[model samples]
Target: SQIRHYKWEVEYMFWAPNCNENIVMGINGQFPGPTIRANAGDSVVVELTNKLHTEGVVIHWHGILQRGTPWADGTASISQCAINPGETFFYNFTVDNPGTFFYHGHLGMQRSAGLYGSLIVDPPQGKKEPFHYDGEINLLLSDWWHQSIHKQEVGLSSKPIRWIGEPQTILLNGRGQFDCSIAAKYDSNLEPCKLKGSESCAPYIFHVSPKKTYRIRIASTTALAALNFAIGNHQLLVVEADGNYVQPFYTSDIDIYSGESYSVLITTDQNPSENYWVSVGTRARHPNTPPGLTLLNYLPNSVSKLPTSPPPQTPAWDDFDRSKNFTYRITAAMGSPKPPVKFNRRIFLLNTQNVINGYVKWAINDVSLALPPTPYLGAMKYNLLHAFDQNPPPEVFPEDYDIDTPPTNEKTRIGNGVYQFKIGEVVDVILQNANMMKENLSETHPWHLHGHDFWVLGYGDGKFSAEEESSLNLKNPPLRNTVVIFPYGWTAIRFVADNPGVWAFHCHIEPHLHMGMGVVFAEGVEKVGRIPTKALACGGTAKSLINNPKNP
Candidate 1:
């Protein structure tokens, strides 16, 4: 197999992603970094140099299953340590599947600072896709904040808890216009938000010929927004999701969550005389900001021409039924892998919000994850179990717990505990969602698995019951790296723990994860031999080198 190499330099730069200037971390001086394309079965090597003088860096490949090379999974405190400033680290891993994925910073709040890009893996030569398209376009969607990432992090962690609130603008392909007209009645400074003469806030425009079917690959890395994507006067035929082929379904708009990706086919059959609006609106939350808009220009039409029509319609912010309906519509395409009927183990996780030491946080099964300085991969492989919290995280919460009201116990435990699984063991994870710290307030959480895609067995409203297990879709469940658990609902997923290493399974929302909304899963890490020395250069792994010649 061939090898693809990328040299990246991570540094802070002043850029306007939403017509609002702020200090953002960029790779190679490009916001959203650079796109990486590789064929399946090929190894990818990224030589990353962290130029941030005060911080460390790591990058996680969103949908790539780094089988056999778990150390290269790029999770900061799980797979490996972060590369400190002025240090260069190489991430070497193979792309085992063909899918529309992405890579982003995994350390601290850097991902929220504009450090992400698309990663497309093509099938091996001569292996064709089940669907056909004339061409393809990639739209990386994200929400933009006017304040710096540091300020946002500080606010989220401060006492009296200042939430980051809603985003200032939505960005498509790294550019957006932050209209000040809405704030004209409140704010005094408006010149900085003007977009008329700004070069960086230009709307993204994609050109297409009329009547041609184009595959649109969309991925979201929003800090905290669930979005609805749509193009004016167009219906999307969803074909692929999270790098897996799904039965084609038609929808005018798609509810795309952070850490989710989809490939939709669109035929440009609309009148070619004028451009159409490509828009994304916030879903599942209050619509505080305006929808993001871009131009879809037919061939021969000028890209500079803005769409005449209003932005495409989006679902109401509180339309949970519509979101749930769209989720249930996705099923495995023919010939896709079928899920195992029986699982070796079942674990139920209760997702809730609580106050931990004066700070508000999200917890799983009553335990908020506290990342230790040592990477779990090295600790597990080296039998250094003391490096982390020895007690295993609870697999299930009390079944009688009410889902409609806030938790009776508001304080949660904090620990960096690993959930261990045997190699090749089929495991089922039931994510139980509950009301937040506030009554009747539960937000949508898009959970992302680090190293493997899992079959989404079923979804249920209210509290999950043992009876629901009988209704799981064992015959043909769609596989995905990221799946959404609707507000106050339950989501069940099953996967074979064949990959050896520690993987971070967490909420894709940046602030949520920062506030401890995740867990680490270790699968047969002892069998993963010969950890890379460079990957062990930080934390407890670094101290082991004084006595042992080879790390891990």
Candidate 2:
């Protein structure tokens, strides 16, 4: 119904997120970036200018389902290449889906470098929400590391196979102070915990009018953490998740994984005169970072004052049962769309942790994804040779595979292969999480799909089985672009391969993706139309293109 235009200047600045200053890359020098609010059925045009002196950049509109405009998907190496330093790029696309979404730097570990912002789309004009709210509060949660992204990347890819330790601090709306006094407790890389003059530690504030209902938008742009968010004395009535309306359910605290978003209703019916503590803590691991702290001001009073009570707590780090139980409670809202009764393809994938040639990597069916120099989409448009492995990727793991025991003989190998699909085919993907290289370790992975949103068919623990009592939510499954597969478990998702372009399906964890945990799908290549000449030239354009100039 409308067009929203904006400009972004990508530049670097010194930011002290946790009382530790670092060279942070931000949009327009704002550490937490900016907010973009639009209505459904609106066209959003963003002109991005890269000002970083040495490196290129790309911003992915995470979970936008680019639809017919795959060129604007903004995934480096998948849809296009990074906009070189000092270059300007334009992303123009329509916002047909109305819910919580975010945009972030998709190049390297830029997201960890503080390059992201909130993108909120509302329901179309004249369309009322199923529930009512007096107001809305948007909370963006993330983990923060004091080290530069360059050093972290190098350490991760080193021959020694070093893991990036837990974050140094937690950030709420891009602000938080870890009060690094613990650095003095022992020898630490988290130095400079001391705050300097003018660097005041400020917490985020959520002001609510007493007895009124408010819609709280929560999105986790965390680079590595599965955060559990809560308030001291309130209940979260979850009504929407990942841009889809879901059956309302209540919880005191919500587990927010990486690459996921949710909207919950909260009433300020608690004690009106006193404020409470709002907190977020790491989930599913031994946490090294401190919990992010903020205040829930029940106002008509001083909103900046510290709360008298302690911050809220959450489920234990290894609370698998607690987390999975909450997931099962989310069902599609009435009038929400559902998948087709029949599917054209049923594919199974096995996810495992492994070491290949002395380097750590995550593999799907024993193959680790390796991106080629040319953008896969551009290569597909021109039919470029050597762009990827000629052989198709494996759709199913070998039989007789054990879920608990680590494989001894199989070595994960790098490959640039794609799963090709005909246009309009309904494809169902079942991803199985096998054991890690260790005998008993299995980790959680947040799977994100680009180009389209898929209906989450179901989830099961301790390996999936077709014979062990089927429980597919065929009646009313929630549609989303990402889903979390628990340790030693399985997740099923179904989507129509109607988009005519190459798309990326991969783990949203920045390090996991770096370690080659992803896949590419080229759908309806025959019907693909022309792309911008500039878009093709920036990315893996055919080398022959320079020798033999051509246009799509």
Candidate 3:
């Protein structure tokens, strides 16, 4: 319906997120960039200029199924190469649909460097929503690391194997005081931390006209943390999720995995004179980092605030049963279409850790994903051989496969395998999380699929068995692009392979993918049509092929 354009300059800026002045890759010199707003069916155009001296950049409009426009998908090495230093590039796509979504640097570990923002698309005009609110509040929830992405990346790949430990603090719309200042005092003798509004900062304030209701959109983009959010004295009426409508449910606090989004309706039914604490904390484990709090002001009360009461404590991270209940409660809203009762393809992916070529990694079906210099999309569009893995990845693992301490010989082999789907077929993917290859441990992994939204069919506590097939909720399952397979559990998702391009299906937990927890899916290559000249001129032969159409 309209065209929205943004001029973004990507450069390094110094900012104290956890009171540590770290160099971050910022857009337009703004921390966490600016929010993008649009309506359904509207066009969003962005011109980005990269200024980094030694690196490149690309922004993925996360959760937007780029349908037919796969070249603008903005995933480096997957759809197109990164916008090189000193070069300007434009991305034009339609919101085509409406829901809560976001945009972030898709290249390297840039998202952790502060290059992210909220992208909200409202429904088309005069369209009534299943639920209503007096207004809305959007919070872009993220975790901030004091170390730069470069260091974080090195640590993840270094010897003795390193972990990007818990973040220094949790940020709300890019604003968060250090651990000591805002975290609830239980055992933590609050460290010497900075206060809110420091360095020209202030705690994010959510203002409400007392007695009116508001819809709070929570978009989580944590680099490596699972979070839970709660506004003191309030219960959340969960409504829409990940760009799709869900049957509304109520909760006190919400569990958020990285790459996921949610909308909760809250009524400002509390006392108008008293302020409340809008708190956030890491929830998948014992609190590694302390909590982050913002102000929820009931109108007429001055914006200056503090929590007169203790911040709400969410369910323990180890309590898997509680989280599953919350997840299963969400179903497609009344009018949504139900998935087909049968599927033509079924795939079982065994996920586990492996040590390949002396390096630790995560693998699927014994293959650790490795990206070739050429964009897989370009390779497919031009039929470039030797640029991608020609062999098909595995669809199942041995029944007796070891979860911990597998035979050293069984460690994974690395490759760039692309799974092919026969276009219109409905496929089922059962992702089973297993213990680390060397230890008795398995953590939750948030898997994200690009260019299509799939339905969450069901979840099981252990390796999924064929006999348990009837347990899936094929009827009215919630549709989502990213989902978490809890520790030692399995999750099943179904989707029609209708998108015509090479798309990435991988773990959104940044480091996990860095270590090979992913695979590629290509379908309907014949329908992908012509390759964009610009999308081809990035790396490998696509750069030379752009000039020599066919001298080969």
Candidate 4:
């Protein structure tokens, strides 16, 4: 396959849905961006030129397997650096798999502002299959915050801070309660507060014949919340998760986490007499938060006029009771005392003192990343970056472990380093959340691993328990790489150190990442034999900035 270069120039502006008075940041001058479509095996080169005045701007193609092209992973802090003001960078990678995926900004709080788009990789020629219906549609779920995203990040970084929660309006493919433009009106009102326009930025709705089957690719790109979705009285057959095919499961509703994706097949059998509402509502991970909602209209082909009344409000649905599911306790603290962690060679968790002006503050086992020298790409061939010991210390930390601030010991530092391991080694990691000084101090941490999927052995609400431990089904647990750790709970996951390369483990929450909640695992280092000299520097368009001496 040949490499194709795609160039995009991006600028920031404010856009509002429905009313033409045009609110700032609510709508972009060129909102909803544009979609990128390609086929499997094709090499893609994307050059992003940031015209926005903001200091940080980066993009990540969610769910794309960079494979041999990790340089294009688009992690500003890790793989490269943020595109500085008026600077440009190129992302190059292969469309190794055929599936539905999307892209969004990775820089702190940029995606929340409106820097996201759809990415589709078509199946190989002659491999395309037909559905009962005539075509396809993309349903991109998002949230709209009228405030400046950069300012929000600043406030969040403050000490003893409180979460203000997300916006009240839920968006579907960029349109909110009001239509996309002033010209776009719904109902008899020149500007009805609740309906979308004909060309409104609403979700991509598919026109289908009754009894016909159609495919729907859905993605949740919201910053930190999960969603509960249903198609008014119609059951959906889910066939895929995060772009990978799964055994079909039928349900009227499904749960979608912030960075997760899904594809479902729906056979519409509803008669033309009634209209169905395809509804989506937010699910709160924290207490005292209100849910958000979005709607989809299922109008019959013969109907000439749209419904005048607003869709009926749907209550939030809980797929599973949170109290019933096994819980895990996670604690965050500083320092690695004597009797070091057995399974863990080093400890690195972000801390409060490390924060700067309530901005970009984070730690791993208590130490901050001082911007280490560039990593050697060739070193990945022989390194097992996240290797663990067979037997870790029975008690990992001392009784007087410091919880007030960052630790003073440099011996137990937690910067970006590599872990080496042999193939087929069963590895277990226990992440403890130790923020006691601040009420509801724990942030949502999305732990992700590469190479292999892991089984979530067990989780706890407050602390570890031997009695509760024995009851867990270690034999077969839900296998996934990204697991959300509740604020005060710990989550246990196990996976064989099989695939060899530099695998990343970190929090999916962008803010926590900027403050330092990530690490890398370099596996199978011994087998690779030798590391090449040229691989020492980070590769790709942002390489120079990442290696800039002033960053650390």
Best lDDT goes to which candidate? 1
Per-prediction TM-score, please?
A: 0.95, 0.94, 0.95, 0.70
TM-score quality measure for candidate 4: 0.70
| Candidate 4 Cα errors over 4 Å, as ranges | 1-4, 17-29, 54-56, 85-87, 128-134, 159-164, 178-206, 285-426, 430-445, 450-481, 486-490, 494-504, 522-552
In the predicted model 2, the residue pairs found to clash are 1-41, 374-540, 375-540
Q: What clash pairs does model 1 have? A: none
lDDT of 3 by residue, 1-552 (tens): 889999989999887765667787788888888899988988888998999998988899999988878888888888887888898888888887778999988887889888899999998866766787999999998888776678878987887677788788888888777646653443366653445354534577888888888989999988888888888899999998999999888898888999999999999898888888888878776677767777788877876555578677766878878878787688988888788789999998888787876678888988888888899888877777778778788888888875554435464799897889998999999998888765767888899999899999988887777899788997789989999998888999999999898889999988888888898898987788666565677666556575666566
Per-residue error (Å), model 1, residue 87: 0.9
Q: How good is model 2 by TM-score?
A: 0.94
Name the candidate, 1 or 2, with the larger lDDT value. Answer: 1
Which window of 10 residues has the lowest lDDT sum in candidate 1?
Answer: 182-191
> Candidate 1, residues 229-310: lDDT per residue as tens digits?
9888899999999999998999998999999999999999998888888889998998888888777889898765656666
Show model 1 residue runs off by greater than 4 Å: 180-198, 304-308, 548-552
lDDT of 2 by residue, 1-552 (tens): 898999889999987776668877888768788898999989999999999999878899987877778888887777887788888988988988789999988777889999988999998977977789999999988888877788899987888787888988878888777755322323355443343324535666788889999999999888899999898889999998999899898899999888999999999888788888887888887887778876788888675444656566657889899999888788899898878988999888899878888788888888988787677778888887667787989998876789999865365688888999999999999999988878888888999998888999999887767763368888899988889999999999999999898888999998888888888888986666776665677434746466665493
Decide which is better by TM-score, 1 or 2. 1
In candidate 1, how many Å is residue 256 off?
A: 0.3
Q: Give the TM-score of candidate 1.
A: 0.95
- Model 3: lDDT of residue 183: 39
Q: Tell me the whole-model lDDT of each prediction, alpha carbons only.
A: 0.87, 0.83, 0.83, 0.55
